[PDB]
């Protein structure tokens, strides 16, 4: 019924309604061919989102960023139209820049100091700002 990917990545089992957030964070080149399924059937999740990206094999850094958005996705490496590998995003121990400290008065939001964070818990996800040492109350990609 539709053009099957030859070479690329299929980010499957994304929590329903979060594919657009994931896609934005990945920030792929403008001419990239992509298929985005939102709120579609899932035997495992009931409903889910899917991101199919042609011609790109995500780098570790991008892969792991996804873990901060949807903790149970399956990264499917496609080659010759076949799934040759399934990866799970890793929640990093530390993060450079990337996120916004949710403390309005943090030195990183008042001065020119790049963000720095540390993950202190994976489930639930708890991220502490290195500088003000306050936990983020939300995950925000800068």
Ligand X SMILES: Nc1ncnc2c1ncn2[C@@H]1O[C@H](COP(=O)(O)OP(=O)(O)OP(=O)(O)O)[C@@H](O)[C@H]1O
* Binding site as annotated, residues for Zn(2+): 101, 106, 129, 132
Q: Which stretch binds ligand X (CB under 6 A): 5-13, 15-23, 94-102, 117-125?
A: 5-13
Instruction: Work out whether 39 is an interface residue with a copy of itself (CB under 8 A).
Output: yes
How many other C-beta atoms can be found within 10 angstroms of the C-beta atom of residue 124? 6
30 counts as binding a copy of itself under rule CB under 8 A:
yes
Q: Is residue 129 involved in binding Zn ion (CB under 5 A)?
A: yes
- Rounded to whole angstroms, the Cα distance separating 94 from 128 reads 9
Nearer to ligand X, 9 or 108 (CB): 9
CA distances from residue 141 to 37, 47, 71 in whole angstroms, order as listed: 22, 25, 16
- 4 touching a copy of itself, by CB under 8 A: yes
Q: How many whole angstroms separate alpha carbon 120 and alpha carbon 86?
A: 26
Binding to ligand X, residues 23-82 (CB under 6 A) = 35, 37, 40-45, 48, 50, 52, 74, 76, 78, 81
With CB under 5 A as the contact rule, which of the stretches 33-41, 61-69, 88-96, 128-136 interacts with Zn ion? 128-136
Regarding 107 and contact with ligand X (CB under 6 A), the answer is no
Q: Among residues 56, 87, 54, 68, which one has the least CA distance to residue 25?
A: 68
* Cβ neighbours around 135 below 10 Å, total: 14
Its sign, for the CA torsion 53, 58, 61, 64, is positive
Cβ atoms 38, 17 nearer than 8 A:
yes
- The stretch among 23-31, 58-66, 67-75, 93-101 that binds Zn ion (CB under 5 A) is 93-101
Q: Footprint of Zn ion on this chain (CB under 5 A)?
A: 101, 103, 106, 129, 131-132
């Amino acid at each position: 019924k539709v053009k099957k990917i030859t070479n690329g990545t299929v980010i499957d089992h994304i929590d329903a309604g979060k594919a657009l957030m994931v896609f934005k964070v990945l920030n792929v080149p403008k001419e990239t061919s992509v298929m985005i399924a939102i709120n579609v059937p899932s035997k495992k999740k009931g409903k889910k989102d899917i991101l199919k990206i042609e011609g790109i094999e995500l780098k570790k850094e991008d892969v792991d960023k996804i873990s901060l958005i949807s903790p149970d996705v399956t990264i499917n490496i496609i080659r010759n139209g076949k799934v040759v590998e399934k990866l799970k995003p890793q929640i990093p121990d530390e993060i450079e820049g990337t996120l916004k400290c949710t403390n309005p008065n943090c030195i990183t939001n008042k001065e020119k100091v790049r963000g720095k964070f540390k993950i202190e818990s994976k489930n639930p996800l708890k991220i502490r700002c290195y500088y003000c040492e306050k936990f983020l109350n939300e995950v925000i990609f800068e």
